[PDB]
């Protein structure tokens, strides 16, 4: 329809283990850790809150999902997903990578030829940051701003908005935490820094010591307002009932 958002990618893991038809395990290493479909020990809803959980301690993870390729030139790009560190994590990634066409999904590991890297990373109390990394001039450029990530056991929504006028916005739990211009907050005037020829693959390319992190409700769209709606329909419905079930079990 004329007022529909473009939904480039969406994944909520609502249909059992049919997700294995959409996500590709990388074969680069023989001993990657295994992702598992799980809702956890405590949850908002048993079926709705099923996501990909890291099932093994002290392992690299390499899983990716492809979608119909698109370019963000001339329009907004929004990347959204939920991260739940149910384990009370010591050290481990919770970020995504957005790759252009031509990625060997079976060869993905520590891949640097992505367009954008985004999301929480935790490694001891001294590392508790949200990455926002852009590929430009063959260099992966990190944000000059310090964004603090969530460190508890609960589900949190992470949102990156990239606009065609070289502006960005970061939200945690549907609330702005950081905002500005791409020329100012990175070490890159070029009107097309924001723009990439193809997005084709979203990758989970991580190391964790204490595993048990759940990933859910992935959204790549061109609509800010829809991401916010979807965030509330998704993370916003999870939050209260999850806290409630956890509070219960704590006795
Ligand atoms: Ca789900």
mmCIF file with all atom_site columns, C-alpha atoms and ligand atoms in Angstrom, residues 12 48 50 216, ligand 1:
data_model
loop_
_atom_site.group_PDB
_atom_site.id
_atom_site.type_symbol
_atom_site.label_atom_id
_atom_site.label_alt_id
_atom_site.label_comp_id
_atom_site.label_asym_id
_atom_site.label_entity_id
_atom_site.label_seq_id
_atom_site.pdbx_PDB_ins_code
_atom_site.Cartn_x
_atom_site.Cartn_y
_atom_site.Cartn_z
_atom_site.occupancy
_atom_site.B_iso_or_equiv
_atom_site.pdbx_formal_charge
_atom_site.auth_seq_id
_atom_site.auth_comp_id
_atom_site.auth_asym_id
_atom_site.auth_atom_id
_atom_site.pdbx_PDB_model_num
ATOM   1 C  CA  . UNK A 1 12  ? 10.591 -12.745 15.256 1.00 0.00 ? 12  UNK A CA  1
ATOM   2 C  CA  . UNK A 1 48  ? 6.517  -14.658 21.551 1.00 0.00 ? 48  UNK A CA  1
ATOM   3 C  CA  . UNK A 1 50  ? 11.554 -17.215 21.690 1.00 0.00 ? 50  UNK A CA  1
ATOM   4 C  CA  . UNK A 1 216 ? 14.863 -11.353 18.990 1.00 0.00 ? 216 UNK A CA  1
HETATM 5 CA CA1 . LIG B 2 .   ? 10.277 -13.885 19.207 1.00 0.00 ? 1   LIG B CA1 1
#
